[PDB]
């Protein structure tokens, strides 16, 4: 079980970037993404910088920068299930084809390249962490954020993201697995505005990413909402 306050947010997904788009979407059931809808451009990064980051990373760094411009934060946690899968796939293809690897592509393939690049671009020498936990990367990553609040970091920037899943992998992932890029940034603080308890579930491979299940339920404003994971669920209450 965990309790926290969430005091600000910034998010981007196919067809969803403006506050009014997110609010309208939270009013709609079921919670769903059309992967054919366009993504908005990065607003805090020069286009050359944005286009050199991967499809998910650029959104995650942009959303993080938006919150760093509005708040003094003490620590940063990024979460991603698939991490830099596009770069990993490119490098595994370089190895298969006996082609040279780009040193920048390799350096940026580390899971923490998004949070690392954010600290460099924002000149922000803050404690940083980067978490992966399969389907439950978002929910388990909140425990990493809570360890940093426990250790005395008052305001923790928390960003969940994925890049596009290369078509190569579509035959080895579940038919339900989301394959589009998105990012959800939250500003976390010590408090009891929200509580979350974990339970067993019969569900797995949700069709909507956990951070977007969360944002839908949180923006919709009902007293109780559920985030589904890997044969578990996360019971949120206001």
């Amino acid at each position: 079980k965990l309790t926290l306050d969430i005091t600000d947010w910034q998010a981007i997904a196919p067809g969803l970037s403006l506050t009014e788009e997110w609010k309208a979407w939270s009013a709609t059931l079921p919670a769903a993404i059309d992967k054919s809808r366009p993504l908005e451009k990065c607003t805090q990064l020069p286009m050359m910088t944005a286009r050199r980051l991967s499809s998910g990373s650029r959104l995650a760094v942009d959303c993080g920068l938006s919150l760093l411009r509005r708040h003094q934060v003490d620590a940063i946690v990024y979460t991603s299930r698939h991490g830099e899968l596009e770069r990993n796939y490119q490098i595994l293809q370089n190895l298969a084809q006996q082609e040279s690897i780009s040193p920048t592509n390799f350096a940026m393939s580390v899971h923490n390249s998004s949070v690392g690049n954010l600290t460099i671009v924002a000149k922000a020498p803050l404690v940083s962490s980067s978490v992966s936990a399969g389907i439950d990367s978002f929910q388990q990553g909140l425990f990493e954020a809570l360890t940093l609040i426990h250790a005395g970091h008052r305001k923790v920037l928390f960003v969940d993201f994925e890049g596009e899943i290369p078509g190569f992998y579509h035959n080895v992932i579940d038919a339900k697995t989301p394959t589009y890029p998105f990012a959800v940034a939250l500003l976390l603080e010590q408090g009891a505005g929200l509580s979350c308890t974990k339970q067993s579930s019969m569900e797995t491979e949700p069709s909507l990413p956990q951070s977007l299940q969360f944002l839908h339920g949180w923006l919709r404003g009902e007293q109780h909402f559920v985030v589904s994971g890997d044969h578990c669920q996360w019971n949120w209450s206001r």
Binding site: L92, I101, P125, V172
Partner: protein, 399 residues
């Protein structure tokens, strides 16, 4: 009205390890004292194009992945299973005592089953049949698979996640497990991690001009970069008193460069200072520092300057990466494990290897060991400085 006034520290209970020094803690302890790593030698088929490469390998036959868990069948998870078998009675006792819900599983990795992902791409692209017998599953290559696999294997229902902060992954895992116990969310935590040899990091570090084809020489005149190794380490952290305490933890970010360190070591200094203040000790109370010491020009220069600044010239220190290799995501927990062995088995301190090119004469004096010597104070420090400028410092002590 008056009421009767009668009406926490984290310890290490057990460590399981595999690395180039051996397949279990007994063999690793012996080989560390001898300064010989049987798994460290030149191997073909990794470094393109058609080159041999000195690598720190685990050659042990690994336990089979139970066939009901075949989605998790990576060498990475079989290395973790081999480490778990060394501490299984202690883990079984913790689960039975505290319950499934009050144990955490916090891993670190920079690879997961990356070699399995590499095999899958090459076998698919060229329709290869004969070379490969491996049943690939996407779960094997996910960075969250180490903690997911161990939680499923042990039925652990507490927090379960993997840190992936490059070379600091498995030392961050130790910090997070320590904090989840301090917070009261769990009573014990299985922490550590594993990284396994893959063509991707070997050729990636070569692309950065940061791979030594020959065995690395940390802090030496002729040093030409890193030697990659693989390792698994599991530590059982607990609130219940044990002979060894986790006295201090420290963390920082450089906010400087994605692969080069802060030239003034600002982040390294911040992490070391944070660990000393958590432990409530001065630099003078450290008996030994297990350095990061990767063998790159920039890392070893920065680190010698930082140790000279905080400790001066009289604190024994060395990098053991000439024995294990740089085990990447596994390095933090591997080196914490070696430090735990020095303390529990009263081993002599490992020297820096100056038998080949000799010390870099441009580096400040910082207490680098020219020969093995006894540990004079029962407190040791292990530091890790990673890509994305991600830094950790750990302090272990006799309770």
């Amino acid at each position: 009205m008056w009421s009767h006034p009668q009406f926490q520290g984290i310890y290490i209970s057990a460590v399981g390890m595999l690395n180039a020094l051996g397949d279990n803690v007994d063999d690793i302890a012996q080989n560390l004292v001898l300064g010989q790593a049987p798994g460290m030698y030149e191997r073909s088929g990794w470094l393109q194009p058609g080159k041999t490469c000195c690598l720190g390998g685990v050659d042990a036959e690994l336990p089979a992945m139970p066939d009901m868990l075949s989605e998790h069948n990576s060498r990475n998870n079989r290395l973790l299973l081999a480490a778990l078998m060394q501490i299984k009675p202690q883990v079984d006792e913790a689960i039975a005592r505290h319950g499934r819900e009050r144990i955490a599983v916090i891993m670190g990795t920079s690879t997961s089953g990356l070699d399995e992902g590499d095999q899958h791409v090459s076998r698919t692209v060229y329709q290869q049949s004969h070379g490969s017998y491996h049943d690939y599953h996407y779960y094997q290559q996910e960075l969250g698979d180490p903690s997911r696999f161990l939680a499923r294997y042990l039925a652990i229902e507490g927090p379960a996640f993997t840190l992936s902060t490059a070379c600091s992954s498995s030392s961050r895992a130790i910090i997070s497990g320590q904090r989840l116990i301090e917070m009261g969310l769990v009573d014990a935590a299985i922490v550590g991690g594993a990284d396994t040899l893959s063509r991707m990091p070997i050729n990636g570090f070569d692309s950065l001009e940061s791979l030594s084809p020959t065995l690395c020489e940390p802090f030496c005149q002729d040093r030409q970069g890193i030697t990659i190794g693989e390792a698994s380490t599991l530590l059982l952290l607990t609130r219940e008193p044990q002979p060894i305490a986790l006295l201090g933890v420290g963390e920082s970010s450089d906010a400087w460069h994605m692969s080069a360190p802060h030239p003034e070591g600002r982040g390294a200094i911040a992490a070391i200072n944070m660990a000393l203040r958590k432990a409530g000790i001065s630099p003078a109370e450290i008996g030994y520092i297990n350095l990061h010491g990767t063998g790159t020009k920039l890392n070893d220069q920065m680190e010698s300057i930082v140790i000279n600044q905080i400790f001066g010239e009289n604190t024994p220190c060395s990098s053991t990466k000439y024995l294990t290799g740089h085990t990447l995501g596994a390095a933090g927990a591997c080196e914490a494990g070696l430090c735990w062995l020095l303390l529990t088995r009263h081993l002599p301190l490992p020297a820096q290897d100056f038998t080949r090119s000799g010390i870099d004469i441009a580096l400040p004096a910082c207490g680098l060991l020219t020969q093995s010597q006894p540990l004079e104070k029962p407190i040791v420090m292990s530091n890790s400085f990673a890509f994305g400028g991600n830094n950790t410092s750990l302090i272990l002590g006799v309770a």
